[PDB]
Design a protein that fits this description.
RBD, alpha+beta, Alpha-Beta Plaits, globular, rna binding protein, 16% helix, Cytoplasmic polyadenylation element-binding protein 3
Length: 114
């Protein structure tokens, strides 16, 4: 059993290079269908890059989020893809399709017996 395309056309991405812009983040995910890319504080920024290495993809179709899910790697319920820049190469990046339902996928601080 799986959630598939359910949620929204928004997808969070973490681990992005410090030197990648909107059109390179777009070209990195355009393989799934047309989209636009946005991030916090962009309205007040002096630079065209995502702050702290994270952004939100907005696809034209929910099928493009499922196409991304079908290309992602997996660990502990986290999903991963890969990207690059003039300064960073072969970088893995964490993928989080937007959905408000609860789930048991959590691994923070690791396992412990007591």
């Amino acid at each position: 059993g799986s959630s598939g395309s359910s949620g929204s056309r928004k997808v969070f991405v973490g681990g992005l290079p410090p030197d990648i812009d909107e059109d390179e983040i777009t070209a990195s995910f355009r393989r799934f269908g047309p989209l636009v890319v946005d991030w916090p504080h962009k309205a007040e920024s002096k630079s065209y890059f995502p702050p702290k290495g994270y952004a939100f993809l907005l696809f034209q179709e929910e099928s493009s989020v499922q196409a991304l899910i079908d290309a992602c790697l997996e660990e502990d319920g986290k999903l991963y893809l890969c990207v690059s820049s003039p300064t960073i190469k072969d970088k893995p990046v964490q993928i989080r399709p937007w959905n408000l339902s609860d789930s048991d996928f959590v691994m923070d601080s690791g396992p412990s017996s007591g």
